[PDB]
Symmetry: D2
Subunit: 167 residues, 4 copies
């Protein structure tokens, strides 16, 4: 198999700059912003987005699992009561896991909860969940890069790639 | 300079847990999917004794909740979707943690959630949680034993004790 | 499908646990800091009964080790540096998991580490782990009860049972 | 009452990380079992930039470590027989990193090495071997590129110095 570039590193960077500007604008005057990354896949997008948000904010992470139940493998280290929470995803597809994570965090009485994802595969949606900011809407391909793995590989590519069969 | 007095004897505790087990057995008669979930660390002794008085095939699991936000330090190992869940507590006082744990688990769509505690301190409640089975209602004293610690000591006492000043 | 036969009766188990607790009490006499550490979920019932037969003030804590690498899904809540640590197991068969848990804990520089188990299957051993206190040494049978499950069932049986396939 | 001063610019950080990724790429050449392991939360930004400058196929994982050094979140995947690179935002006393290394050594990786974006050598309390270092600094009050003050400023793109104004 091989990887072709689907979304270039610079196209990704420009889109994250735009998301950063929109998010900065939306939260202007808030000192309670916290970005929460869903591990492992969101960490690259999160790193780049945080650096494009010109507001003082905090960072946290959750690891949610998958058989049926959405379980918390690692919860947040910090409180979110009365805070503005931004969930940060690498890719939203079925929306299952994200939906339960949002509901679990809603119980803690944050000031607000929103969601931003680098990629959205809306044709995979099985439970709808409100996504405030989306980097790129894509079809249901095997994508990798910018934090996203194929068999644990390729998270470290600076571009969004597509895994394709060779010769 | 402090000591432990017996408040509820080893045998009084055992008789009560025998009675709870009988009522719980009757209650879930014909459920194919009973699961007891303890809250660690305090629940484990009461859980062990109670599970042995329940004359139904059932599963056991544990959560560790945190102690401002209620966070999940260690989640269930198994699924509870469509199951009858019995939350098992050593003591309910403010009700804050238990309430949030119930709300977290309710998101998983168990068939039912009910709650059983060995000790209840009703005068300490800060939030409404409905508890179907209560071993003993007690005044707000420093109690220890049957899983309950004081500064981590005395969980291993077979009786419910009360910590008292000496001299 | 199957039935369960009594292999070691409730009373036999209670008597042996009392013997072990007595020996453990003698062994750590004069120790200021005993901590019993159970591996979840299997060890919780044995732990509850055993701690109640140990007549020294002590602490209780728990770990959850993964089911190749032995990973820590839930670590101890409390420190063990300088303490006498007693690892508590429902059953020891291959010894692989328990060996790693011991090495992991030794890095924290406890004063000592010893191991107790309710059941021991010495024929299944794959690594050398020395076990000072053994409730019952048994053949490689499918056992359940007193914390031990089969397909998550039967942890709540008050005896050690043998699972027996039928027709 | 404070501000933050730029101590090491975004561009200096970027160039140094590229140099580190190059050295790392060269060192691990021919190995197909590279895994970078960051310690949360501080390492995630340096990790993200470093991984993208490493031109070898590799895996990425995370641990979060807590007197006793405890494991609050372990790795998700096996490291037996692998080349492990622990990735750190800053190394000061070394105490946590030393124990994490010891813990992972029990799993029999083929090798374990350590990289840090910042190193404070005069702060060292335990000896631990640090293989790659982005910037060796004095004991300044630092933030940015993953590093916080009171949970704030991990999002700054440069290494900043917190300068009390109070």
């Amino acid at each position: 198999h091989t990887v072709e570039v689907m979304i270039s590193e610079q196209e990704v960077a420009q889109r994250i700059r735009e998301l950063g500007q929109q998010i900065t604008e939306h939260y202007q005057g808030s000192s309670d912003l916290v970005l929460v990354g869903l591990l492992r896949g969101s960490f690259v997008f999160m790193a780049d987005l945080a650096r494009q948000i010109h507001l003082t904010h905090q960072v946290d992470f959750m690891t949610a699992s998958s058989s049926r139940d959405v379980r918390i493998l690692k919860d947040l280290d910090d409180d979110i009561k009365g805070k503005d929470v931004l969930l940060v995803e690498d890719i939203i597809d079925t929306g299952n896991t994200l939906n339960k994570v949002k509901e679990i965090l809603a119980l803690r009485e944050p000031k607000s909860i929103r969601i931003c994802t680098l990629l959205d595969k809306p044709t995979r949606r099985e439970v709808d969940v409100e996504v405030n900011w989306v980097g790129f809407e894509i079809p249901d391909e095997f994508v990798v890069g910018v934090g996203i793995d194929y068999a644990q590989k390729y998270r470290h590519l600076p571009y969004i790639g597509k895994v394709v069969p060779l010769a």
